[PDB]
Design an enzyme around this catalytic site. Structure first.
Site, PDB file in Angstrom:
ATOM      1  N   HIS B 104       0.802  -1.230   0.000  1.00 25.52           N
ATOM      2  CA  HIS B 104       0.000   0.000   0.000  1.00 25.52           C
ATOM      3  C   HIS B 104       0.844   1.294   0.000  1.00 25.52           C
ATOM      4  O   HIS B 104       0.306   2.366   0.190  1.00 25.52           O
ATOM      5  CB  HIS B 104      -0.947   0.039   1.200  1.00 25.52           C
ATOM      6  CG  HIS B 104      -1.691  -1.231   1.431  1.00 25.52           C
ATOM      7  ND1 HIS B 104      -1.192  -2.258   2.211  1.00 25.52           N
ATOM      8  CD2 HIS B 104      -2.906  -1.641   0.998  1.00 25.52           C
ATOM      9  CE1 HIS B 104      -2.069  -3.246   2.241  1.00 25.52           C
ATOM     10  NE2 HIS B 104      -3.117  -2.899   1.510  1.00 25.52           N
ATOM     11  N   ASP B 205      36.060 -29.006  17.840  1.00 22.09           N
ATOM     12  CA  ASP B 205      36.328 -30.292  17.226  1.00 22.09           C
ATOM     13  C   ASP B 205      37.563 -30.349  16.328  1.00 22.09           C
ATOM     14  O   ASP B 205      37.460 -30.303  15.102  1.00 22.09           O
ATOM     15  CB  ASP B 205      35.106 -30.775  16.463  1.00 22.09           C
ATOM     16  CG  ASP B 205      35.158 -32.258  16.183  1.00 22.09           C
ATOM     17  OD1 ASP B 205      34.088 -32.829  15.900  1.00 22.09           O
ATOM     18  OD2 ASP B 205      36.224 -32.933  16.228  1.00 22.09           O
ATOM     19  N   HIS B 208      38.221 -34.358  14.693  1.00 18.94           N
ATOM     20  CA  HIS B 208      37.719 -34.866  13.416  1.00 18.94           C
ATOM     21  C   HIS B 208      38.607 -34.484  12.238  1.00 18.94           C
ATOM     22  O   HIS B 208      38.515 -35.100  11.181  1.00 18.94           O
ATOM     23  CB  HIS B 208      36.284 -34.378  13.146  1.00 18.94           C
ATOM     24  CG  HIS B 208      36.203 -32.985  12.591  1.00 18.94           C
ATOM     25  ND1 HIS B 208      36.558 -31.871  13.320  1.00 18.94           N
ATOM     26  CD2 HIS B 208      35.794 -32.527  11.381  1.00 18.94           C
ATOM     27  CE1 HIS B 208      36.374 -30.787  12.582  1.00 18.94           C
ATOM     28  NE2 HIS B 208      35.917 -31.159  11.401  1.00 18.94           N
ATOM     29  N   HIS B 213      38.716 -34.822   7.194  1.00 20.12           N
ATOM     30  CA  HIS B 213      39.357 -34.039   6.136  1.00 20.12           C
ATOM     31  C   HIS B 213      40.632 -34.674   5.553  1.00 20.12           C
ATOM     32  O   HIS B 213      41.428 -34.000   4.899  1.00 20.12           O
ATOM     33  CB  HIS B 213      39.646 -32.639   6.678  1.00 20.12           C
ATOM     34  CG  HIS B 213      38.412 -31.845   6.957  1.00 20.12           C
ATOM     35  ND1 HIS B 213      37.560 -31.427   5.959  1.00 20.12           N
ATOM     36  CD2 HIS B 213      37.878 -31.397   8.117  1.00 20.12           C
ATOM     37  CE1 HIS B 213      36.557 -30.756   6.492  1.00 20.12           C
ATOM     38  NE2 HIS B 213      36.731 -30.715   7.800  1.00 20.12           N
ATOM     39  N   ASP B 362      32.504 -32.425   5.545  1.00 19.89           N
ATOM     40  CA  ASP B 362      31.678 -32.362   6.757  1.00 19.89           C
ATOM     41  C   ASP B 362      30.177 -32.619   6.577  1.00 19.89           C
ATOM     42  O   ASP B 362      29.489 -32.963   7.535  1.00 19.89           O
ATOM     43  CB  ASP B 362      31.801 -30.968   7.388  1.00 19.89           C
ATOM     44  CG  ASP B 362      33.099 -30.765   8.149  1.00 19.89           C
ATOM     45  OD1 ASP B 362      33.752 -29.740   7.918  1.00 19.89           O
ATOM     46  OD2 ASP B 362      33.524 -31.548   9.015  1.00 19.89           O
TER      47      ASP B 362
HETATM   48  S1  FES Z   1       1.664  -0.562   3.196  1.00 20.49           S
HETATM   49 FE1  FES Z   1       0.138  -2.071   3.638  1.00 20.49          FE
HETATM   50  S2  FES Z   1       1.309  -3.914   4.065  1.00 20.49           S
HETATM   51 FE2  FES Z   1       2.797  -2.349   3.843  1.00 20.49          FE
HETATM   52 FE    FE Z   2      35.350 -30.286   9.352  1.00 22.70          FE
END
Ligand code: FES
Ligand code: FE
Ligand code: FES
Ligand code: FES
Ligand code: FE
Ligand code: FE
Lengths: 193, 447, 193, 193, 447, 447
Positions: B104, B205, B208, B213, B362
């Site tokens: 709006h 961690d 791991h 890796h 991962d």
């Molecule tokens: S102006 Fe109406 S929802 Fe944003």
């Molecule tokens: Fe990792």
């Protein structure tokens, strides 16, 4: 052919690229390009990554895939980095990724992945200055299946440059992809587009 | 589930019920007791440096607009129109003095104020009290050396106190290096894992690394290459682990300034960091200067993680119990040369970004561990975090916090989950404080 | 061109197949194959199943689609059946399926299904020994829509053998598909890939 | 080639269309058509909508996409409207849609949309009576990405008629698409197929 | 919903509330009272015959590793690492002496024992009690002539007793034929239906055959071709229906040894089965020998189904109230010639596999009946299973169980749903027994 | 959530809690208190004019078969088989004397009666009471000038009374024009929005037109072109807003007979409507005759909407809190020439159908406003509908209902949400009546 002052949604880059193909009215080059891409996709689909590197990729390659930040259509003041590099690789960097794929301790590769690639909309045109440089445009749908029920599908347009180096074999010297999905819904983008 | 009584984390953070990674009701309860109560990463000054610059960011599942005001401050607002609730801004970043709703036409300023309403005089006359119709504002927005965090809860501790004992560890890189910058935009990927999975992995961690890796270590030729396949155990005194009262914690790996970066960057980085470490010796002392050029794997409670030196910066954005949106940025030292800055950024994404070959190692770990938390026979099982228990200390003369004087252990898990239990069984900040009055004694019990 | 001792993710079969196409440097055969597949897809898409059988399928056809069990990349001891046959049909078996499709009491066919097929990446090469035998490789994306909001998409690579029998009409004598998704998330695999 | 009394699932229309392509054994026309469609897709993908209109669309165009009501395979008494028009546009109507796309106050176009189109299965045949009229059949997969995590994929077969008007440029004079998904699961069908 | 009081199945199993095929809360409650309490199909000896052979299998929504031990026994374990809960094995089958977790490298043996922990001495010292850290084990694993079933509940009846009166019917084919084998791997497809829909259809639904499968019958030229479109009603004494105390049941169609198989297999099969039936006459009697070469459509409570003779073997794996993962194997007689074995396997998949033209006839039936269970106006409607009620007997001199001496009826539905109500309103096995002390009287009430 | 006590809509319908567009539990409660209790659009006589003609339609999430009986009446039934609950009819329209279930072959008549059961004599004998096994029937089916509505609740008011004061406004077009017809089939699209979002937008939202549809107005050259970008405010007395006791309401824009239609149709329409308006002046008076050729944006509570003159007819079918299936038909005057009828139908779909360039302007508005209703910080926020409050009247000499004598305002939202609160906090129709005994006083409070 495009006037970007009138075709307001069109980027200068895109207009540049389409000019290069509306005037390479050249059927044989189109078929050569088709063959090149289909063979590249096949090697990739069977996971022959070393073969791909040796036969399809040039030593001076730039293999690049970007993720562009979402900005206003009317944005004109904010000028910080527009994109990041998902990939931006030279030949050595591609070799590292290939080794990472081949390594017996890549646990993610067991059981074996299944790739299926679809290449369409191929266009080809020689470069104006470097007569040994071929521009090739194509779109790819890439399907990856793994671990029973994991399925990821990737979609993209590829802007390539290919050059005959040695053996006369035409090889990839530049691939540029502006990945169309900002947020990936596919676990990762760990595939060669 | 009664979250006042349910033991989700055992005493001393020794174990956690597997369901925490899978339960949707608990996820909903975390929105309230973790995400609406704690400090969450928004952005960096380097991302919105000029007036009117803004980014959107997630805070839990909420989306906010983070905007640089004319007076140089930063304010953050719910990305939601005050009329019928449409999402106000549809981009990730830009510059503007205000935001107009496309439903709006209501016009909001960058300060969140309702500035204009189409044909206000003819439709609302004087009835509309605009002063009361500004965008819902994030109560607390604070900075840690350029890094901007937000908190929906006014009763929270200041960010610095929230960081507690972890602050000391971060300062050399975050403050004394002359400052860090965040290189955007970030990589954004959805993984099918609980946000706590990557949070816990980054917080403590190191165990791991050698195994998960293995392939990345072997392939990249980074400074931790040996270690691949658990081929070698890091030497005695290779590093330490720390954790803190409000949950943040980190692993410290002595001297690993080139971090995850491949051989192509190691020489330059190792030279750059050493040069700075020499200058810093006089300013903050040898230990602290070393910390600066040492690799820190840290999680800032609850869902912001980083690897200093490697330069990896992560936000684990929650979607649902098995869904997480991962944001990846690169952190660089401001005084680095530009070309080095660009190459480091690319290398961070190359290793840990959307197509990061390390991060991919991962994925399955995180996703299945999370997904198994929903499986009937596993919901009531106990995840273990007892490694190094009974050897942690508090109040050390040199290294503050609850500290495990070893490179590999589960100290940081324990502190992370201790703060997590306390928050989930608490209705507000005062109750968390009461539930945390003997936190360090709880963590060092058997020492 | 592939060394599978080096390209460790590549199956012997896949390496065999790619050798057969890197050396049929033959444009006209490629276009013939393209036409054959596009016409086959069209007849299939309009559900002209009897036409398909009469015009595209050879009397000696083997129409096969397998689902391969997920095994360890390093698996070397377990040797039981690696795959099952989703399809493994001779001409008569295909005829039964076609009759089943045409039968007025196939309730699942009302309302009428909608198929759309996309054929890409076509490669063609004559067989070394049987000069009347054409090898054709292509990828298919098959889209099936039914009952308002049911949508299934299938993806696959097809290894075909086509032979001119009588009328000179080139017909399908073997189709082999190793379906890439182990667990189907599409209700069934009741479509002709 | 089809007998629809025997191939019971086949519509008279579909049988008509396939007859028109099994006898235009004509390779050059096929390649011309391929080029035409690939160029059209490219212009569309970069959102050069005015260019598309000027270079690809004829002044006498009918641009039509229908959604057909789901009826019994055996239905024979109910004769009310079988379909509605998602699109049924003349050149002016297409121009309005293009203006709507270009308008700076189209809020839905900010940030910029990302389109990627895949055109496959191209067939071409000249019309029997109007020697200047070319029939072109193709399938399209259209991928639209927007706003971080919105992803819509569209699938369809296109029945086109193209004519050389002036400049000798072959332009689109009729596009007909019977959209295969009855209920769209893609937010809207606001894309040019 | 109070499952102690809610009448989900009326007295004598005459009707069921449509919501049972759609309610997610009830689905969750079934995980506990159906899937965690009852016997579930895992695999067959022929699939893991050698030491170290393993397959993964579902048990409810849980995933387990099923492994042949060195001593020849079979043990089954939760496919979940005891440290941080990652999924241990990512394949469907193989051979190994142990399993290593790819997260932190913990090594488990095929016997589920925690065998090795990387750098255990340096990290855990002596603190780690490995004896207590073996994989969570399935309490009960038992065999029925090579077919392996698992049960999470220690208090359950032995498998043989669980099969009750249905055992007698299966024995001729499962035991006296010289043994069956399972041909893998299985077809795997997800359907949008409740697991009970296909379970109930296979347990007692011969009524749908003529109409649902009209097109398949007409097209295949199988021994039941006449019957297509309900063109003919099977003759008096064409077969029977039986059900049992713990829910398993089946339909018996006299002499239909070639079953759903197309004319290409009928002669060979009909010859093979008859030859064996002659030999079996002396060993187990005429009636039982006939049962052997008779078509049995059976469900082993709760979610394992089969068609003997046709050789179709199904597992209806539950995902959620409207989602089921269908596994399809082929069952063959061990002494059949290999070529016949291969052709039967292909024909089973051809008819009832992922692209099975018969199974496809059933899809819409199963999916909509299930999906309608979520629709507001249908949740409280009654599904009917009253066909043949008041003509069933118990304690017959020749055919044991609750028996309907007719080929087409709903006897097996009634017994299936009677056991289902009893379980869902029961907290344990003792309560189910108490709720089942007059089961056969309940089923034959009006006879 | 206690729906008896929870204030979801403030007094006088001034505000609504944003969660109403996102809460799944409330959605479930609406199935009962909105969709099972109120009148819902099914079809039009022009769509099933001959005996045996039928269409399927949604009523909430339930699906029904709507069939023309031999006696000319219309009856509607749940599209669900009375045996095992399969969906009976799989098409959207056709003609038939009955419907046969493809599962077991039960045959139902177009009057819902169970007519035949395969081999009934041999299987059921005489046991089956078919009279009690007819399709579950929709209790109330009524017509408003050819438009057919259904209601599951027998206690509801007749349709005419249900329409209340809105009936007067619709009559000129629906009755006095000589009758309307519905042009099918409809466009069908799924949007990610709550059904109330488009319902509220069509019931009283003229405020968004100038701004949301700026681009469409500018591009189409329709009679409301000026107004694009809120460039001009409509003149004093450009129209009005009304609402009614049972929730239906509409906006009236004086003389806008060509409505959303582009310049290509404006001359013909404006000529056609004016010609009819002259004839109607003598029959129903000037005011009412004008109403006929005036643009009405109306919602018939709860989820049927329309734009008269533009000829847009919508059903917002609910799926879940953020999912709606939109059905779009075209309404035309029966005495219009056929060619005009066809062009109007195409223009309705061109503007508001699946690829409607106007409807697309609304998508993001509806989806995000709905989706934001699930976001933690927004659930308890207040959506505002206070525009024009305190200037509405009741009992006017000329315009009946609660009326806002202005083209743009929120009167119709208020009445819509007033009826919605009353229904959701009510267990039946009597309680809604009691909760609505001062409805008009509540809506005009400050006037
Ligand atoms: S102006 Fe109406 S929802 Fe944003
Ligand atoms: Fe990792
Ligand atoms: S989760 Fe398995 S070793 Fe840690
Ligand atoms: S479900 Fe309809 S006849 Fe049985
Ligand atoms: Fe069946
Ligand atoms: Fe609108």
């Amino acid at each position: 052919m495009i006037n970007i002052q009138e075709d307001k949604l069109v980027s200068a880059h895109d207009a540049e690229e389409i000019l290069r193909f509306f005037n390479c009215h050249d059927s044989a080059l189109q078929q050569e390009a088709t063959t090149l891409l289909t063979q590249e996709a096949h090697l990739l689909d069977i996971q022959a990554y070393r073969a791909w590197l040796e036969h399809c990729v040039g030593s001076e390659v730039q293999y690049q895939v970007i993720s562009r930040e979402l900005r206003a259509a009317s944005e004109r003041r904010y000028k910080l980095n527009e994109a990041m590099n998902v990939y931006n690789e030279n030949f050595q960097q591609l070799k590292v990724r290939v080794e990472h794929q081949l390594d017996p301790q890549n646990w993610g590769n067991s059981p074996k992945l299944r790739f299926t690639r679809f290449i369409t909309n191929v266009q080809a045109a020689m470069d104006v200055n470097d007569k040994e440089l071929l521009h090739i445009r194509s779109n790819v749908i890439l399907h990856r299946a793994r671990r029973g029920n994991q399925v990821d599908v990737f979609y993209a347009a590829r802007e390539d440059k290919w050059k005959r180096g040695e053996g006369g074999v035409r090889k990839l010297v530049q691939r540029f992809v502006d990945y169309p999905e900002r947020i990936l819904q596919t676990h990762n983008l760990m595939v060669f587009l | 589930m009664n979250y006042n009584n349910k033991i989700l984390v055992s005493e001393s953070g020794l174990s956690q019920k597997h369901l925490i990674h899978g339960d949707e009701e608990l996820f909903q309860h975390e929105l309230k007791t973790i995400f609406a109560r704690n400090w969450l990463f928004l952005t960096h000054d380097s991302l919105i440096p000029a007036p009117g610059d803004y980014v959107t960011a997630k805070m839990g599942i909420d989306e906010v607009i983070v905007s640089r005001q004319n007076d140089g401050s930063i304010r953050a607002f719910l990305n939601v129109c005050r009329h019928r609730g449409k999402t106000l801004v549809s981009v990730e970043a830009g510059n503007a003095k205000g935001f107009v709703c496309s439903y709006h036409g209501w016009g909001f300023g960058s300060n969140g104020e309702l500035q204009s309403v189409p044909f206000e005089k003819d439709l609302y006359g004087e009835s509309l009290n605009k002063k009361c119709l500004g965008l819902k504002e994030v109560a607390r927005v604070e900075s840690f050396h350029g890094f901007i965090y937000g908190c929906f809860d006014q009763e929270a501790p200041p960010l610095m106190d929230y960081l507690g004992d972890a602050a000391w560890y971060l300062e050399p890189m975050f403050k004394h290096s002359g400052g860090l910058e965040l290189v955007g935009p970030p990589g954004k990927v959805v993984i099918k894992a609980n946000w706590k999975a990557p949070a816990e992995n980054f917080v403590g961690d190191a165990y791991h690394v050698g195994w998960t890796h293995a392939s990345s270590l072997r392939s990249g030729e980074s400074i931790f290459s040996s270690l691949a396949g658990n081929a070698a155990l890091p030497p005695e005194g290779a590093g330490l682990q720390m954790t803190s009262k409000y949950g943040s914690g980190m692993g410290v790996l002595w001297d690993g300034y080139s971090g995850v970066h491949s051989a192509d960057l190691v020489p330059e980085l190792m030279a750059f960091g050493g040069a700075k470490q020499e200058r810093l010796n006089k300013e903050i002392g040898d230990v602290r200067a070393r910390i600066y050029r040492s690799h820190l794997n840290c999680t800032v409670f609850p869902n912001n993680s980083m690897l200093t030196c490697s330069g990896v910066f992560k936000v684990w954005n929650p979607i649902d119990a098995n869904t997480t949106e991962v944001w990846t940025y690169a952190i660089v030292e401001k005084d680095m040369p530009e070309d080095l800055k660009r190459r480091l950024a690319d290398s961070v994404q190359r290793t840990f970004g959307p197509a990061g070959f390390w991060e991919s190692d991962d994925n399955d770990n995180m996703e299945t561990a999370s997904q198994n938390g929903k499986k009937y026979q596993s919901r009531d099982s106990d995840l273990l975090s007892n490694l190094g228990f009974g050897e942690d200390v508090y109040g050390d003369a040199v290294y503050p916090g609850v500290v495990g004087k070893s490179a590999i252990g589960e100290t940081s898990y324990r502190g992370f989950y201790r703060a997590y239990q306390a928050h989930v069984s608490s209705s507000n900040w005062a109750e968390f404080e009461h539930a945390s009055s003997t936190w360090h004694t709880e963590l060092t019990k058997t020492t």
